[PDB]
């Protein structure tokens, strides 16, 4: 069959991946007692957008559910699936003659059918007529809440949909559940996005020099990912925090745009991941800017390496993800005590939620078409209202096929530390005279992408992780990647 490919050494992705997703969705829907025979899934693809009121086009990236189901890269499409038969129909825009001048070849419907391996292709202006002819019982559309953004996913609509009976509640939980569990074909793509992003992280580590701006490494990373990986998009805005900025969790946005000069003695925390064909990667490397860990940097870093490997070693089906977050907390606290930053009973530290002072975010999250992937809090799975844990993007138990980030970290965040020092229940554990030395340290995060297997996990990421490995990698002299 056909495959998506950007040539050179980039991954060929079979369009059968999407056909399998459509089949898996129908199979789930058929088992749902509420789903009527003759139902049709109706999805609306993303449309082209501009900057505000200007004609400056924004580069189009497909809506994630529509991509999962069809893998279609063109804007302005719709896609439907007959639940009972699994038959797929793609609706494509009927384009004007001038498109041939400005945008490119005007492809036939047959071209798209062959390209996307769907059962039928029609024009978007015919969708109402085509669906009517099929005499469906009900149209199943997509509406639900994303539990990371809190945004409501908006329903497909088209001229004349009012004449149909529409259900917008059944589909969202079902398609979300399918996305939670990755097929072998999806895993091949995620192995690839991790491979390229890992290589790019290595190139960045080799290239970092004191005196560079953070954004120079962001630029290099994205260039590696695009030119070598065919990754036109990143999975998210590159987080390139040096020095105190490594304590800022989602540093790098427009308000704090990776514009600090890297200084001797800084820790770097680089959280970056390319996207290939709308599949994510999400990797964080932490390392000394000057290629040599200080004693303090080694201690903090190896604390996070310990919780990372402890969690990965414990992960397997049936394990409760919040228990892993708590494991990481307990390990961080043990290590910070060994360093002399903390004193006292670690049991008591845990009871006082002291772990969340140093790791205020969740241990990790589902990953897939979206970097913060869907399905972390389905109905019946509650958010835990405690420091740290309340930021977890899922409270589910692990099952095979789930893809998760494992990203413990330790940070020195002034407002959290100040809060803890003011609280007598936590202050007693903190040794101010030692902690003071770590103000402005920043932080360390070690982020791997893994897949749950029948017996444990498979690690997708491949970057240097021990202190020795990192120092060796940064001292490497290969002019493997030297632009101009």
407 is in an annotated binding site: yes
Q: Is 393 annotated as a binding residue?
A: yes
- Count CA within 13 A, CB hemisphere, residue 362: 21
Other CB atoms closer than 10 Å to residue 386's CB: what's the count? 14
Q: Which of residues 237-296 bind Mn ion (CB under 5 A)?
A: 271, 282, 284
Residue with tokens 């009012």: 162
Q: With CB cut-offs between 5 and 8 Å by kind, which of ligand [O-], a copy of itself, ligand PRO, none does residue 149 bind?
A: a copy of itself
From the list 21-29, 314-322, 359-367, 467-475, the region that binds ligand PRO by CB under 6 A is: 359-367
Contact by Cβ (8 Å): 371, 356: no
Q: Is 329 in the site for ligand [O-] (CB under 6 A)?
A: no
Q: Which of residues 434-453 bind ligand [O-] (CB under 6 A)?
A: 447
Report the alpha-carbon distance of residue 274 to residue 226 in Å, rounded.
8
Q: Among Mn ion, ligand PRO, ligand [O-], none, what binds residue 393 when CB lies within 5 to 8 Å by partner kind?
A: ligand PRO
Q: Could you write out the DSSP letters of every residue in 425-479?
A: HHHTTB-HHHHGGGTT--EEE-BEEEEE-SSSEEE------SHHHHHHHHH----
Q: Which does 216 bind (CB under 5 to 8 A by kind): ligand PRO, a copy of itself, ligand [O-], none?
A: a copy of itself
Per-residue binding string, Mn ion, 442-461, x by CB under 5 A, is: -----x--------------
Beta bridge partners of 135: none
If the CB atoms of residues 227 and 466 are measured against a copy of itself, the closer one turns out to be: 227
Q: Which helix (H) or strand (E) holds 53?
A: none
Binding track, positions 384-423, relative to ligand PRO; x by CB under 6 A: ---------x-------------x----------------
How open is the CA angle 309-441-270, to the nearest 5 degrees? Answer: 55
Give the one residue of 113, 365, 396, 426 binding ligand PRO; rule: CB under 6 A. Answer: 365
Is 202 marked within a binding site?
Answer: no
Nearest CA to 73 out of 99, 95, 48, 108 is that of 48
- Based on the shown chain and the rule CB under 6 A, indicate whether residue 370 belongs to the binding site for ligand [O-]: no
CB contact set of 357 (below 8 Å; sequence gap of 6+): 387, 413, 416, 417, 419, 420, 426
Contact 188, 182 (CB under 8 A): no
Please give the annotated binding residues, written as ranges.
250, 271, 282, 365, 372, 393, 407, 447
Footprint of Mn ion on this chain (CB under 5 A)? Answer: 271, 282, 284, 405, 447
Please give the annotated binding residues for Mn(2+), written as ranges.
271, 282, 365, 407, 447
Footprint of ligand [O-] on this chain (CB under 6 A)? Answer: 271, 282, 284, 405, 407, 447
């Amino acid at each position: 069959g056909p495959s998506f490919w950007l040539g050179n050494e980039t991954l060929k992705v079979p369009l059968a991946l999407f056909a399998l997703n459509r089949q898996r969705l129908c199979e789930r829907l058929r088992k749902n007692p509420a789903v009527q025979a003759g139902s049709i899934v109706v999805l609306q693809g993303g449309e082209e957008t501009q900057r505000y009121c200007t004609d400056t086009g924004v580069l189009f990236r497909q809506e994630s559910f529509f991509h999962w189901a069809f893998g279609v890269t063109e804007p302005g499409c719709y896609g439907v699936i007959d639940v009972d038969t699994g038959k797929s129909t793609l609706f494509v825009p009927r384009l004007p003659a001038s498109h041939a001048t400005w945008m490119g070849k005007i492809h036939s419907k047959e071209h798209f059918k062959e390209k996307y391996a769907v059962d039928d292709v029609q024009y978007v202006d015919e969708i109402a007529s085509v669906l009517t002819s099929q005499k469906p019982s009900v149209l199943l559309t997509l509406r639900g809440v994303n539990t990371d953004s809190g945004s409501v996913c908006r329903e497909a609509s088209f001229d004349g949909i009012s004449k149909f009976e529409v259900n917008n509640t059944i589909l969202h939980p079902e398609i979300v559940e399918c996305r939670v569990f990755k097929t072998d074909m999806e895993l091949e793509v995620l192995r690839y996005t991790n491979k390229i992003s890992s290589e790019a992280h290595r190139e960045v580590m080799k290239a970092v020099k004191v005196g560079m701006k953070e954004y120079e490494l962001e630029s290099l990373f994205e260039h590696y990912c695009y030119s070598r990986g065919g990754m036109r998009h990143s999975s998210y805005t590159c987080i390139c925090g040096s020095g105190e900025n490594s304590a800022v969790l989602h540093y790098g946005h427009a308000g704090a745009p990776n514009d600090r000069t890297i200084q001797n003695g800084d820790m770097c925390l680089f959280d970056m991941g390319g996207e290939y064909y709308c599949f994510a990667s999400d990797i964080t490397c932490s390392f000394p800017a000057n290629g040599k860990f200080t004693a303090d940097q080694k201690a903090v870093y190896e604390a996070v390496l310990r919780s990372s490997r402890a969690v990965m070693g414990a992960m397997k089906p049936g394990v409760w993800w919040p228990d892993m977050h708590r494991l990481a907390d307990r390990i961080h606290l043990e290590e910070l005590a060994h360093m002399g930053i903390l004193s006292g009973s670690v049991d008591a530290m845990v009871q006082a939620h002291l772990g969340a002072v140093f790791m205020p975010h969740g241990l990790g999250h589902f990953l897939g078409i979206d970097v913060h992937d869907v399905g972390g809090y389905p109905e019946g799975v509650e958010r835990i209202d405690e420091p740290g844990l309340r930021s977890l993007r899922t409270a589910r138990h692990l099952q095979p096929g789930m893809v998760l980030t494992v990203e413990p970290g330790i940070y020195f965040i002034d407002h959290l530390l100040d809060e803890a020092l003011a609280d007598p229940a936590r202050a007693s554990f903190l040794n101010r005279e030692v902690l003071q030395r770590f103000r402005g340290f920043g932080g360390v995060r070690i982020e791997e992408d893994v897949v749950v297997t029948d017996s444990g996990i498979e690690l997708l990421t491949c970057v240097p992780r021990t202190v020795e490995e990192i120092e060796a990698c940064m001292a490497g002299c290969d002019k493997a990647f030297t632009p101009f």
